[PDB]
Write a protein that binds this ligand. Structure first.
Ligand code: UTV
Lengths: 144, 148, 129
């Protein structure tokens, strides 16, 4: 008796130059029970409470120089609306003073979502993204 | 609710000056399956393992000669007061000198853990310096509980 | 539905050994009782009394050993560079379609840096959806 609960766990494309592109067409990545991936967005199949999450890993070869801001945000666009309203968001400054550094950003929470809602997981600096290993950059939803 | 699991995700009031006031009667904030928000606290409706989480974002326009302390704490009140999760951050490791252009700092504090909780337990997420809270965007300051 | 929430052994210092209270903990790994969707999660907490000479890398990874192909694949992984006492938590969690017999491991690279002074912060679990 499989669960008919809308789920998604999409991973970053390690090929995408200067961007964060999500894939469902990889090992241990899924899109099930009505969830779609259109224009780098997860599309909500039906109303209900959902658990929403994302992780991104940033890496830079030494802090030198100038102050860097790393944002990671999960946004929602309701049906008939156009602008992304932020659900979860984090701003990290990895530079103390101007040796490789690492900053993981984990966002997660519970949200009531509507049919046709489009969800985005975005970063401001894809030049700092790290996908050497698997499991480092992901985005998903779990229908409760 | 199909998954009758007690859940909460409350958000800071960007309007409420010098304080950290939680809201649910707002867009993209909820209380479900028995969770209540009473006197800036989430009230546990039933015994169980819960995930408790909270994020706050502090921002300051340049590090003055001051050596600031930023705390964020999640506490529990049962039918008895206990500290669950706590973090203390010092954003001024090197206080900027007189003659330098003000460089804004950022310090996010995320707290989260799994705790066995009892019916009627009251959870509070508090900070020491609400004057440093950042409301430039939404999705930055929140508090929630998910029953496992 | 089947569930697990294992916690670190606070006396088993120098190792990340899970303790429990059909999700069976066998050989420090979680065994998938049946086919299906699972939520997998872990939190580890690292602590160090001032930053050392060498640049330290803290990794935390959840891996799958698929019963069918007997191979080890990272499902979720993060890496942190913490370099006065410091505290660094690492959070992992996601939904995965797993098969009966599949093994799950939650591992770290530096157990010497593991803080046992908290249990509400060092756990590993699965929840069948
Ligand atoms: C890793 C983290 C932050 C944790 O410590 C934890 C413990 C119990 C269950 C989930 C947990 N977390 C992830 C997580 C957080 C919020 C919403 C969904 C979500 O999970 C996703 F996987 F669905």
């Amino acid at each position: 008796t499989p669960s008919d609960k809308p789920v998604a766990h999409v991973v970053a494309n390690p090929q995408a130059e200067g961007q964060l592109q999500w894939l469902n067409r990889r090992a241990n990545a899924l899109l099930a029970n009505g969830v779609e991936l259109r224009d780098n967005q997860l599309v909500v199949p039906s109303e209900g409470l959902y658990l929403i999450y994302s992780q991104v890993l940033f890496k830079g070869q030494g802090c030198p120089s100038t102050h860097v801001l790393l944002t990671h945000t999960i946004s929602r666009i309701a049906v008939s609306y156009q602008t992304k309203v932020n659900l979860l968001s984090a701003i990290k400054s990895p530079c103390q003073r101007e040796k490789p550094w690492y900053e993981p950003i984990y966002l997660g929470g519970v949200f009531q979502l509507e049919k046709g809602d489009r969800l985005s997981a975005e970063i401001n600096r894809p030049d700092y993204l790290d996908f050497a290993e698997s499991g480092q950059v992901y985005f998903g939803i779990i229908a409760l």
